[PDB]
Amino acid sequence: NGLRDPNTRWTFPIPYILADNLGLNAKGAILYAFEMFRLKSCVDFKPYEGESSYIIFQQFDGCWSEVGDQHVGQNISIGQGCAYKAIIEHEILHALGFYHEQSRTDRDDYVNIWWDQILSGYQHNFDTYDDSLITDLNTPYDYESLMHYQPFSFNKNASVPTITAKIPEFNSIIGQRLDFSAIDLERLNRMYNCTTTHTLLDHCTFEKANICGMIQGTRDDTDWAHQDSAQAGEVDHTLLGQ
Amino acid sequence: NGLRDPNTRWTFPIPYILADNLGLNAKGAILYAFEMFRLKSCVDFKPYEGESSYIIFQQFDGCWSEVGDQHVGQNISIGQGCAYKAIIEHEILHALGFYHEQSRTDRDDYVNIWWDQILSGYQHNFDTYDDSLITDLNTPYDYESLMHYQPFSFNKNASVPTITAKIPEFNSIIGQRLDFSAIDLERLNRMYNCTTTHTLLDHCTFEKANICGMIQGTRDDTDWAHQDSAQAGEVDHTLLGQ
Amino acid sequence: NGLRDPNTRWTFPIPYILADNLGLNAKGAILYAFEMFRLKSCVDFKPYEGESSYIIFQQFDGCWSEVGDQHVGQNISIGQGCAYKAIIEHEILHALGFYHEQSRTDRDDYVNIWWDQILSGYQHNFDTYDDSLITDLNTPYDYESLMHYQPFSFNKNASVPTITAKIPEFNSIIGQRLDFSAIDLERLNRMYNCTTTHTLLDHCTFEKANICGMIQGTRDDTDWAHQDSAQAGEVDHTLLGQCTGAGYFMQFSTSSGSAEEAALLESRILYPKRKQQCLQFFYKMTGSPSDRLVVWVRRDDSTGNVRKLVKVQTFQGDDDHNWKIAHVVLKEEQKFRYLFQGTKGDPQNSTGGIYLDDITLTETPCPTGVWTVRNFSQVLENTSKGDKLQSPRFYNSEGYGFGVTLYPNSRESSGYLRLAFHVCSGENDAILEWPVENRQVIITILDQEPDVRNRMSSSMVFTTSKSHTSPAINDTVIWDRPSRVGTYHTDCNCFRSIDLGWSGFISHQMLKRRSFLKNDDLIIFVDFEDITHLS
Amino acid sequence: LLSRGCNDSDVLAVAGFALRDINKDRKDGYVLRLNRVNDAQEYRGSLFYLTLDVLETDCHVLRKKAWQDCGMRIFFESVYGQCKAIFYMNNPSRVLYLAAYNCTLRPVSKKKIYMTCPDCPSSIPTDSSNHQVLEAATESLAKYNNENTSKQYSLFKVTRASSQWVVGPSYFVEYLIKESSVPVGLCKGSLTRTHWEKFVSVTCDFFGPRGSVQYLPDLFPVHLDLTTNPQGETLDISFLFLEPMEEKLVVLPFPKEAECPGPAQNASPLVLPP
Ligand SMILES: *[C@@H]1O[C@H](CO[C@@H]2O[C@@H](C)[C@@H](O)[C@@H](O)[C@@H]2O)[C@@H](O[C@@H]2O[C@H](CO)[C@@H](O[C@@H]3O[C@H](CO)[C@@H](O)[C@H](O)[C@@H]3O)[C@H](O)[C@H]2NC(C)=O)[C@H](O)[C@H]1NC(C)=O
Ligand SMILES: *[C@@H]1O[C@H](CO)[C@@H](O[C@@H]2O[C@H](CO)[C@@H](O[C@@H]3O[C@H](CO)[C@@H](O)[C@H](O)[C@H]3NC(C)=O)[C@H](O)[C@H]2NC(C)=O)[C@H](O)[C@H]1NC(C)=O
Ligand SMILES: *[C@@H]1O[C@H](CO)[C@@H](O[C@@H]2O[C@H](CO)[C@@H](O[C@@H]3O[C@H](CO)[C@@H](O)[C@H](O)[C@H]3NC(C)=O)[C@H](O)[C@H]2NC(C)=O)[C@H](O)[C@H]1NC(C)=O
Ligand SMILES: *[C@@H]1O[C@H](CO)[C@@H](O[C@@H]2O[C@H](CO)[C@@H](O[C@@H]3O[C@H](CO)[C@@H](O)[C@H](O)[C@H]3NC(C)=O)[C@H](O)[C@H]2NC(C)=O)[C@H](O)[C@H]1NC(C)=O
Ligand SMILES: *[C@@H]1O[C@H](CO)[C@@H](O[C@@H]2O[C@H](CO)[C@@H](O)[C@H](O)[C@H]2NC(C)=O)[C@H](O)[C@H]1NC(C)=O
Ligand SMILES: *[C@@H]1O[C@H](CO)[C@@H](O[C@@H]2O[C@H](CO)[C@@H](O)[C@H](O)[C@H]2NC(C)=O)[C@H](O)[C@H]1NC(C)=O
Ligand SMILES: *[C@@H]1O[C@H](CO)[C@@H](O[C@@H]2O[C@H](CO)[C@@H](O)[C@H](O)[C@H]2NC(C)=O)[C@H](O)[C@H]1NC(C)=O
Ligand SMILES: *[C@@H]1O[C@H](CO)[C@@H](O[C@@H]2O[C@H](CO)[C@@H](O)[C@H](O)[C@H]2NC(C)=O)[C@H](O)[C@H]1NC(C)=O
Ligand SMILES: *[C@@H]1O[C@H](CO)[C@@H](O[C@@H]2O[C@H](CO)[C@@H](O)[C@H](O)[C@H]2NC(C)=O)[C@H](O)[C@H]1NC(C)=O
Ligand SMILES: *[C@@H]1O[C@H](CO)[C@@H](O)[C@H](O)[C@H]1NC(C)=O
Ligand SMILES: [Ca+2]
Ligand SMILES: [Ca+2]
Ligand SMILES: [Ca+2]
Ligand SMILES: [Ca+2]
Ligand SMILES: [Zn+2]
Ligand SMILES: [Zn+2]
């Protein structure tokens, strides 16, 4: 679902303005979304200093972004309730050249669109783009994607889903608003050549015998066992003896 | 173990020459090693066509490389007996700005060097470098590294190792020459901003209910089950009931 | 005693080099002396970066300087045994432009030189200089000057002084090596046009009704009284009832009202020049144990508005009701205000309150351990020679446990106080490197004056070292792990090392002067920090 | 003496003949190459005291090639240093004559080589106590004695040697030979002992003014004071001529080292005197 043309790619840090029409709750939610980007990708943000393109975030009507870097600098809107971190993250993924997951070229292999159940005047929000416009980034269609729309989106009747997964399990999943999915990060990283997150400094689960390059001191008396999770109650926290 | 200065980086594909002093076996093995780079990383190689920096591969005395891009273009030696892919990969990792693993700044935390067992005049081959010359790329010391020297490296006595792991199990593993380690690929990717690789087009292990973006036909009769390994005697191949 | 020619003045910060022929102990003591200049004057120092004139500090024969800026750059020697801050300060005053005080043009009006008692070939070190070489900076002759010479200076016979004051009392005072004198700082300020100093950020004794530009909260419940020392039995710490109508302090009564009522006393805004500060103050908590004195910061929220509250340290009531000393490490890098909340706790069980006086705020580390000894004059009479007191166990920033032994009456000499450091076993020892290879002890007998420029705190410095050993521990290092090498004390459930320090750290007849025993009690500061990074 | 700029064109010409004469005297080791004139000071034809900063070529002195016919050594192989010399040139008689010299040489810093290229064969202190060097030279010779049998050859002396350990022990050697009396050639060779299989290689190539040479160990001290006399001390060069021209000469104490130094043939600090 990424915009193919490499000119549409930002160059980090994306300079940003927060407009003063934003509530405090929306300004703080934006900066919290930036921390998630910086924490899960090489995407970075800076305050504005006269750059040619930049995001201005706004409390305009609705919650929306142009897709990819418009080289004049661009609005994003964050209307009421879009203060939720995941909705900021979704709009910033549009700003980072990403279309909705149900707008993939291959989307019809994965999701039904119930055109008959869409509100008249809103069927075009389920358009799909050709592969000259968008890459797959060599990724599968992801139901867990933050870019996906939930089942009850643009529907005539509140009880009837506009969009459903052809693998029927995923009806209970599509359009999650938790966070980026693992494939949304995999895509974002393929799009921006990100190999290292700005804030994940280290992590370790000891699954490997080099213990994540920890060492044991010699000034101390003794050593910690690297323990195999095999004993009757003494399981690890990563796998819980699974 | 990466050469910090970003001026020392290549720009892919690396243009290369195979000199005719290479035996046919050595030419063929070098191309096989490039296919491993192209398969495990975004590193690529092209035949030389007039570029300012390039690698020339030659059968000189022994098997060696300058470290990082020398902008005038540079020799890799692959002397007689160095034809195995892992040795070529090790030398190409030197040309790609890597030092040996036991030359990391922190190496003394992870390996013992038995200085008195090193042959006289060969102590320098165990010189560490400071953090001004080299990055860890925010990665642990990796005993399984291809760059790591074998326990018997420059040793006086063929029964006695020069270098041993402070975690004694890794005595048996230091200086593996199978392949790139997982962390050597991680470091190469963090060095050269890789995420994809040129020659892995897809893979699937089914561990995710998404089934790797596979879909099931409807002009066929039935469906493949996404079968759970929980049923007795009926495990998957990825984990084999582990 | 200042060199008249203005071409001999430095321009700050003085660029410096510490030569590697200096011991670590000397390198640390020189930096500590620079901190005392920055804490009492507008003198400042910097690492050398290729400047024309500079000081290189070295460990040559003896301890000396050229006088004033030599424009090509100049040596200071701190020969072995010269480590103590006052000697370093004396030689840095020579480099700043000051001659010895007994070399003043008018000296003979103030001192006797017993020339026949001087060693032959040393009498020229007692020459007096004319008014064309030197200014008085319009200051009197100062017997308390650090630039003065001890009675026993270059003398033939160890029983006989070379130099005595014409006013015979000052025989007991000449050549003090505590610190800069008040007049030495006034001269230094008059030479270099100083008014501020880099490392005293604020102080308050509440003497003016202005309360040092402190204010009171209005979002709190009530107020601290700006309380007069004239009320019987309720003296402030600045004057302790020594003057009528002039002792003032803040008091927050907890004897009436509800529990958890509070008052904020809040400073004027401060613009820190360093990343760390130490808020010293004196306080009492005579009210119910459940009373709380809570120290807070209000700091710039980064919009330039000083509104971000940060609770930093809570002081709680104890059986002691006399004036305690507090130090709170602040870590402020943006403009701020230090705040005291008092919290009423069970007024039905309070006959008293919380009190504050003698606040001082320095842009320094805090003393790593602080010991008070109460009724010290009464202790000093009651104690036999070679009896001891031991401090409770402090921990340094690295987690080494340590303490000090005070021997109020030295067995090594009559009328001297002996004071010595030791490492203590503590909850961290198992992981710390042993021996204590390069940690630098600074012990100070605090001079209790709020204004740091009015303080002549006696201080002695050593660095725990591999050379420090005894046959009492089979000739092993004193600073090895105290469970191995020290002696046990149920007195704190600790091991303690063999102690090292000074017999006659200070004489009793010196300690009774100034503010070292201000509330008839002694205050000792200890620092014990690694100086390996100076190597 | 008229000190001469290190880039002075007559000095630049003189240096190439002086170096050729220095090689002409050398009866063992390798042909030296100019890196750059670093001193030249002239007594008055013209008598020059000199310091030449120098490299080692890939040719042994017993090989019949002139120094200009030869190549420079690769960075990791490098030997370099200073030659101090005394040389005379008579413009009317076209005379070109080295009188004396002293040359101090070092291998390149084994550390700085490892810093530039980690697997580069590090050079060995040359002696028979390195049994693996003897094994390498005898194996490469034994291979050549099987590659040809029209003649057979014997190891005369091992000259230059390096080793490496990236595939197990790999040794590289250069040595003199004669038949199975004076040498006939220089041979390069190698031995690489992987646990499962040896590898062996070989090449074979086939074939004064008072001074001194030393190959010192790495991390330039030199002496050439032929007199102490401040007035100078006598020399004679009159033997150069078919007719008895009066050509006695003077040596004064050796001159101590703005148009200086000369430009380097290889500017790398790996092969540059301080
Ligand atoms: C009421 O407060 C008193 C102490 O406070 C003082 O008395 C009030 C009535 C007011 O006049 C206050 O302004 C004034 O400061 C509390 O008494 C203290 O109780 C504690 C705990 O039982 C005692 O601590 C012990 O002390 C011994 C040494 O004597 C130690 O060995 C123990 O380890 C432990 O620390 C303390 O001695 C005692 N102090 C006095 C002066 O009596 C009282 O408990 C409190 N009442 C309530 C209901 O909170
Ligand atoms: C993420 O990494 C990509 C490589 O994996 C980068 O892709 C390369 O970007 C180059 C420009 O920066 C492209 O060069 C252009 O190539 C076309 C022909 O394809 C020429 O017409 C252009 O003149 C040429 N531009 C210049 C200035 O020479 C590379 O072709 C391109 N390579 C590939 C495989 O796409 C991405 O730029 C990089 N993205 C980010 C945001 O880091
Ligand atoms: C891998 O990705 C990195 C970003 O995550 C790239 O690093 C950036 O490369 C820029 C050049 O392409 C650097 O800009 C230059 O910075 C220097 C100072 O370091 C300035 O003097 C130059 O003026 C400036 N260039 C211009 C045109 O002004 C960035 O500084 C640098 N950023 C960081 C954080 O390192 C790597 O280049 C890239 N490497 C590879 C092998 O792909
Ligand atoms: C502390 O305050 C002093 C004043 O109370 C300063 O003294 C003044 O310094 C000036 C230079 O900064 C002097 O000007 C020079 O005077 C000499 C004759 O003394 C002339 O030859 C020079 O031409 C003149 N300079 C110029 C540029 O013309 C003042 O004369 C001098 N005033 C007095 C009364 O001495 C101290 O310099 C100052 N100390 C510091 C460290 O700032
Ligand atoms: C929304 O959709 C539901 C399901 O299609 C409709 O619910 C049915 O309505 C009929 C009457 O028209 C009832 O007899 C059925 O019992 C209902 N089914 C259920 C599951 O409750 C509903 O009418 C639709 N509403 C609108 C406004 O379109
Ligand atoms: C090489 O190392 C081995 C192993 O340490 C040495 O073997 C010892 O040899 C002596 C006799 O020379 C025996 O008494 C010991 O029992 C052997 N030790 C072991 C552990 O087997 C060997 O001598 C060494 N050789 C050299 C040349 O260093
Ligand atoms: C500081 O004192 C030292 C010791 O005399 C000076 O160091 C050497 O002194 C002798 C005599 O001046 C000279 O021959 C050496 O050349 C000096 N060496 C150096 C490194 O200076 C030193 O010059 C004095 N002054 C300073 C500014 O360092
Ligand atoms: C140092 O000064 C003292 C005080 O004048 C001298 O003390 C006298 O010493 C002699 C014995 O040598 C005694 O007989 C006197 O009674 C002492 N006098 C007093 C007042 O105690 C001492 O001799 C002097 N020493 C020197 C070397 O000059
Ligand atoms: C790669 O190694 C070869 C080893 O032969 C280098 O080539 C020699 O370089 C020197 C100095 O330029 C010349 O004197 C020799 O004549 C060269 N020999 C050959 C066979 O060409 C070469 O310079 C090295 N570097 C590169 C980038 O090729
Ligand atoms: C100190 O002296 C007072 C009398 O002024 C006495 O009541 C008090 O108990 C003494 N305190 C100590 C600790 O000796
Ligand atoms: Ca341990
Ligand atoms: Ca099907
Ligand atoms: Ca007061
Ligand atoms: Ca109030
Ligand atoms: Zn002095
Ligand atoms: Zn290598």
Numbering used by the authors:
A (entry chain B), B (entry chain D): 66 to 307
C (entry chain E): 66 to 600
D (entry chain A): 31 to 74, 79 to 214, 231 to 257, 299 to 310, 324 to 361, 366 to 382
What does the paper say about this structure?
The zinc-dependent metalloprotease meprin α is predominantly expressed in the brush border membrane of proximal tubules in the kidney and enterocytes in the small intestine and colon. In normal tissue homeostasis meprin α performs key roles in inflammation, immunity, and extracellular matrix remodelling. In contrast to meprin β, meprin α is secreted into the extracellular space, whereupon it oligomerises to form giant assemblies and is the largest extracellular protease identified to date (~6 MDa). Here, using cryo-electron microscopy, we determine the high-resolution structure of the zymogen and mature form of meprin α, as well as the structure of the active form in complex with a prototype small molecule inhibitor and human fetuin-B. Our data reveal that meprin α forms a giant, flexible, left-handed helical assembly of roughly 22 nm in diameter.
